[model samples]
Target: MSGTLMAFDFGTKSIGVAVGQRITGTARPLPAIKAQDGTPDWNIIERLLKEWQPDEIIVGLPLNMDGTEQPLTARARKFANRIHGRFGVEVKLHDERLSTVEAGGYRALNKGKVDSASAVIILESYMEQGY
Candidate 1:
């Protein structure tokens, strides 16, 4: 089935969301949701999920420079598991080593801020890497 994919760049302070089409490979930023004690706003996430009706989800996993999993990796995995279990959607994890830096550059070139745009970049990068 042809459907959109949702991507998340989870941070301690906020979570960035993006949606992309599987056939087109283009992505756009959703919005930055406020985090309560490092957890995202479930209400907002639920709303986005209902609106997007994505067929799959991708979560960016931040790793160390030496290719080691960071402390947040476990948290990301847990979040992914929750998404899969709760939404019954396929969840994939992408190594988002330099997505932030890359997105910063993109935002600078586009003369815009990087917060949500960075999430879009991360999702696009995951799509490129996966397919």
Candidate 2:
């Protein structure tokens, strides 16, 4: 609640990471972690946990436009569970409807890839909406 909070935008090919300071409502982008076999790089995740030492983690739960869970929603939940099991950090799920689309539009304006920035958007959205 008071310390750093990390958020993840999980994709099949990559996972976006972001960290936010609860007091400031400011968030920064972390590097995208490549996923193999639909799983993120454990080493990268571990390194982030070591560096940031986040008090809580929020994972974007991808849902359909109709507010229904997508197939990837289960995968996101599994990833969140894995993060909690491995890092022993509080993991929360945020409804991520349209986050990717919004992130993509934002990144397009900057002429950059949307993946990492998408993660930032995901984090910022969660911080604003959830906390």
Candidate 3:
């Protein structure tokens, strides 16, 4: 399943998205989109899916440092389910431990934010896992 894909860093207020190819194991950040109460405009999501036509979608799964489930973990899982159910694309949950920390240096260059760069980091981590 090494192919073009899109990855997301989901949040209650904002969701970051990026596109990448598994062969190269590289991703580029896209503009972050806003969400309301953990929900985003599905129409925009549809547009991006249609535009990119990715082979799969990666949703970052936020886990506790001790490898436990937290509130956001469930929310992120629900988010991934919704995307898969609505769009009918293959959705994968990527363990996103320390992705933000690894992407720390990219924040200043990423419009003073961390989501988009974190999105890239998430994708790279997934790629490294060699699915």
User: Between candidates 1 and 3, which one is better according to TM-score?
Assistant: 3
Clashes of 3: 0
Supply the global lDDT for candidate 2. Answer: 0.82
* Residue 65 accuracy (lDDT) in model 1: 75
Q: Return the clash pairs for model 2, or none.
A: none
Write candidate 3's Cα lDDT for 1-131 as tens digits. 64889999988999988889877767889888789999999998999999888999999998777777778889999999999999999999998764234646543555624568778878887887776
Candidate 3 off by > 4 Å? 98-107, 110-114
lDDT of 1 by residue, 1-131 (tens): 67698888877777777889987878887767767756876778778888888888888887887778888888878888887787777888888774235645543422222566657877889788874
Give the clashing residue pairs of candidate 1, or none: none
lDDT of 2 by residue, 1-131 (tens): 46688989888888888889987879987667889856987888888889888888889898887799988999999999999999888898888885344545543433223467777887888878866
Clashing pairs in 3: none
Using lDDT as the measure, name the better of candidate 2 and candidate 3. 3
Evaluate model 3: give its lDDT. Answer: 0.85
